Design a protein around this ligand. Structure first.
Ligand SMILES: Nc1ncnc2c1ncn2[C@@H]1O[C@H](COP(=O)(O)O)[C@@H](O)[C@H]1O
Ligand SMILES: Nc1ncnc2c1ncn2[C@@H]1O[C@H](COP(=O)(O)O)[C@@H](O)[C@H]1O
Ligand SMILES: Nc1ncnc2c1ncn2[C@@H]1O[C@H](COP(=O)(O)O)[C@@H](O)[C@H]1O
Ligand SMILES: Nc1ncnc2c1ncn2[C@@H]1O[C@H](COP(=O)(O)O)[C@@H](O)[C@H]1O
Ligand SMILES: [Mg+2]
Lengths: 258, 256, 258, 256
């Protein structure tokens, strides 16, 4: 928990994190599935409590390289969690409507309301990742955006939002295996685009981008967690453990009316 | 199971439906939970197909009296179904912005997009239900709304939306038990409001409102299903069966 | 003046309307400008009353061929009218987010609120115009849309919206002059899109589409008005006259609080 | 005029500003109306150019006490300006849907898009004004909001928004005259509410709230302008002048 939490010291180095690391769990895959089922049951109960109390706002931000485990995390971690209090907001290629306003406009629109848990499948961070790597704006523009994000997230947290930002960390070789597996799976072949290859060629620039973004935006109010995502079982257990510990820390109570 | 589908003949009578009816399931609770688990697995797969194909739009409308089982249906029927392709839109007391436009404005906003399944926890029907009962607009205004709804739903269906409307039918005595159980449960005591007593006094007017709404709006394109909701196990199984049968009927295919 | 209102008889013929017709005004450009200034002053007062009363909703729909006078009508007719109670909603090429829902979704979003006057620069009608002409959906799909529109407009009118639908009617030769004038004007060439020429080639199909749309959707609750728009002075006077007469007919009253 | 622009030094004192001040104009009412007509013609042309170029975003924020001249400024300054590129976003009593998210959510939603000029009739500043005065949230919560505003406005400006914030400054006696004139005018009586009288009972607290807000949020990127609004002719001329000078400074060009 404390080991994977990026301290707000601005001394973060992504090389200090191994995507194949599983040191926080002992028993291996079979034991982790059992432990995950226990955390998932607790998560279902915690969400019902969040919805009932209707005061806190929970924002889960998911960021990863293509095939890093974004969709898998949503699927497995939030499995069985009530759709009435859980919402997924995906952020893709901005439209002309979205580009006509500031980059935060489309994002701020999707923020969770009181008693709601919202998952961001990609986020406002894409405006300091893809736009940096592909040079969609000059440094003089995207460099100022780290301060914007820190301050947008401070405002959200001050106004009652609990912000959990997860970087699902995979290796270059793991991305290759997963992209090939997606291509060879007939039920997953539809997810693949030609543009995914150009992001594979820019792997190093994207790693430099994530390191810069995490170093700049992991705060006390909105912390970043580096999740070793090479082994899905560990990724699913660790994301669930961190989320459950956070929600348990809010000390939420059922309202008692008159 | 088509015995629960309200025919578009305008001859619908709610008295012909018993909330304690379980005749479509040959067995009880334990057998129904097993049957529901099979239907839920099929539902998970059909939504996966819906999202992937990305062509059809699925709208599930839930309407019931307070404690009728709307929250329970969402929880149990859509348990395990991917949150990326499933969305819940709740319709409560209209805001000033909402009331400043036509009653369909806030509802049309929330319609499902291609490859999305949207559940309406209460809907545009509230504008011919609570609105009628409490006379929030005169008889002259809300009577014209039946035609508006039929025509809004025709447009949605013609444009590619599969509309399933479920009326979760509970009895007056079942509501009394559930409202008391809600009050005596500390984890459910929050759902209880003082205004729930006034709505209990208006039970008969609300039943008259539902009968009128269902009779007027059950169409070939947007059918109404009366679900006997006194037994949660039966309610959950029947809603899942009707939903799975409908989605299987769309003959959805994974893109090439 | 009731000669331009299309009766809900389904017997409408666009050939019975001459774009160069000026028979409702006993004079020319100079007298019409004076008459328009009187109507514009009345319109300014009528809008202040609409906003104050805060009950009625006013929807002005503008439809015309490219360079038919939609922007000019907004500019001249609503000149001096308070921006607090007047809004323009433009409908262009639908986005992917817009095409993912029914064609009425993006249009219903922009409907006027109580005490507001909204102008639709192009509208839901485009889904039976450019959609019909270029076969963006099959005949089996867009033919059902006349009933959808009639019923959407009935719901709006029943719920308190006053619907004025204006077809700004220009000749094929007038469009040629205006498109050329647009191209030769440096302050107006930004408006000229290359596709305008392709829409000009399809002139006859578009006239057939407008005749069909007007014949099908001109109702007692939402009437269509064919405005001879070849002479801008007449177009501006006639639209202002019809709008002022309609708003005067609402017999709006200033609220009288306790 | 640079004399009315609040320097980002945090040393702003509202007592240094006289609502009856007219020192930037030497001619008087009749001469100012003529000068305003010239500026309004320039404003009409500059908006047509903003819309055509479709790159810049213009945000005009209006803040004043009740009857301070917010509606009058919109009416007179933007008179004849094309409605296609001009939008008014009013911020009133927050709805339940609005209060369920952060106070900036409803505000950020209304920001101008490329080629659009948006006027905020009241704004996000209300969340450090009526919220401060009436203690709708505790001091601990609204004190943090000045930093939020500065940073929200920095982000907007960095992303291409030209932010003009105008405080229409009226005296306590001028408000009394205007509220009475509103009450005695049959065509303006509707604008009067019983709650307007409490905002007069709390005049001093509101002045302390405006001084705090202006001192905390007047920046190089989003400046505050204190407009002596006791004389409408001067208010309309000065707001017009500042706006026209700003828009002329954008050096906007017609696309090729
Ligand atoms: N702000 C943005 N600017 C540019 N590209 C973006 C932005 N947000 C998301 N994207 C990209 O849009 C794509 C969406 O892909 P997906 O939603 O996974 O199908 C990803 O490759 C993102 O990197
Ligand atoms: N159109 C409407 N007009 C009036 N009340 C409504 C409308 N739609 C929903 N409601 C009511 O809003 C309430 C929502 O309560 P809840 O289920 O606790 O969120 C119920 O009492 C509904 O009947
Ligand atoms: N429903 C629609 N389907 C297709 N094209 C449309 C639709 N609505 C508007 N358009 C077109 O979008 C364009 C907008 O151009 P403009 O007037 O320059 O903004 C016109 O060519 C319209 O015909
Ligand atoms: N954030 C806010 N919190 C509370 N009241 C507000 C807020 N924003 C605006 N208001 C008030 O809403 C009212 C709107 O008045 P009106 O001009 O009649 O529409 C004013 O009294 C404002 O002070
Ligand atoms: Mg106000």
């Amino acid at each position: 928990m404390k080991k994977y939490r990026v301290q707000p010291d601005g001394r973060f180095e992504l090389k200090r994190f191994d995507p194949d690391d599983t040191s926080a769990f002992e028993g291996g895959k079979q034991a982790a599935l059992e432990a995950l089922a226990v955390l998932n049951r607790r998560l279902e109960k915690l969400q019902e409590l969040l919805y009932a109390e209707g005061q806190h706002k929970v924002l889960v931000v998911l960021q990863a390289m293509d095939a890093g485990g974004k969709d898998g995390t949503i699927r497995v971690v939030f499995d069985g969690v009530n759709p009435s209090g859980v919402r997924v907001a995906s952020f893709g290629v901005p439209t002309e409507q979205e580009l006509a306003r500031d980059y935060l406009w489309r994002v701020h629109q999707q923020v969770p309301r009181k008693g709601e848990l919202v998952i961001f499948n990609r986020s406002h961070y894409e405006d300091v990742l893809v736009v940096r790597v592909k040079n969609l704006v000059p440094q003089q523009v995207w460099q100022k955006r780290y301060r914007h994000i820190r301050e947008f997230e401070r405002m959200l947290a001050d106004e009652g939002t609990t912000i959990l930002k997860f970087f699902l960390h995979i290796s270059k070789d793991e991305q290759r295996q997963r992209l090939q597996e997606r291509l060879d799976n007939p039920e997953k072949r539809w997810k693949f685009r030609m543009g995914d290859l150009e992001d594979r060629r820019l792997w190093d620039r994207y790693q430099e981008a994530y390191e810069a973004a995490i170093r700049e935006t992991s705060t006390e109010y909105a912390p970043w967690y580096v999740i070793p995502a090479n082994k899905n079982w560990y990724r699913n257990w660790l994301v669930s453990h961190i989320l459950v510990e956070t929600l348990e820390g809010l000390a939420m109570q059922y309202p008692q009316p008159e």
